[PDB]
A paper describes a structure:
The 12-kDa FK506-binding protein (FKBP12) is a ubiquitously expressed peptidyl-prolyl isomerase with considerable homology between fungal pathogens and is thus a prime candidate for future targeting efforts to generate a panfungal strategy. PPIase proteins all catalyze the cis/trans isomerization of peptide bonds N terminal to proline residues in polypeptide chains. In addition to its role as a PPIase, FKBP12 is a member of the immunophilin family and is the target of the immunosuppressive drugs FK506 and rapamycin. Three extended loops, which have been called the 40s loop (between β2 and β3), the 50s loop (between β3′ and α1), and the 80s loop (between β4 and β5), surround a deep active-site pocket that binds both FK506 and rapamycin.
Residue numbers in the entry: 0 to 112
The structure:
Amino acid sequence: HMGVTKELKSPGNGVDFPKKGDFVTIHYTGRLTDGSKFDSSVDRNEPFQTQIGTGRVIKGWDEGVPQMSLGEKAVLTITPDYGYGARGFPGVIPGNSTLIFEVELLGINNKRA
Ligand SMILES: C=CC[C@@H]1/C=C(\C)C[C@H](C)C[C@H](OC)[C@H]2O[C@@](O)(C(=O)C(=O)N3CCCC[C@H]3C(=O)O[C@H](/C(C)=C/[C@@H]3CC[C@@H](O)[C@H](OC)C3)[C@H](C)[C@@H](O)CC1=O)[C@H](C)C[C@@H]2OC
């Protein structure tokens, strides 16, 4: 999927992958391309929970996360068009920003890594 690239860092179980409509549990760290963190669920010590593939989150997550298996650690590199685009996200992300997320897939529906 063109606006997002996934780099596997450590494999999950290689069997359970999120599908459109699933609810996933994720720990993440987002950085801008200058290397600076803009947000982290890890530092916040709270897991992030959301439906995937239904537009609840940026396109880059919706298209990137279903490519990971349960337990996988990856990096999702997201073009502005698949992120917050020209506007950015007021108070956090400048307009026209590539987003780089470290993502750990901790849960899919009832299943847990
Ligand atoms: C009631 C409060 C808000 C409510 C916030 C929470 C549940 C708390 C939860 C931990 C979010 C974080 O709170 C510390 C914080 O996460 C960021 O820092 C971040 O790392 C980020 O980019 N994420 C979060 C992880 C998934 C990818 C992306 C996202 O898709 O986030 C989603 C997002 C912003 C979608 C927009 C929606 C508007 C569209 O126009 C735009 O389309 C381009 C896309 C978030 C999760 C929404 O679904 C839910 C919310 O908005 C945002 C920079 C701002 C966000 O706080 C606001």
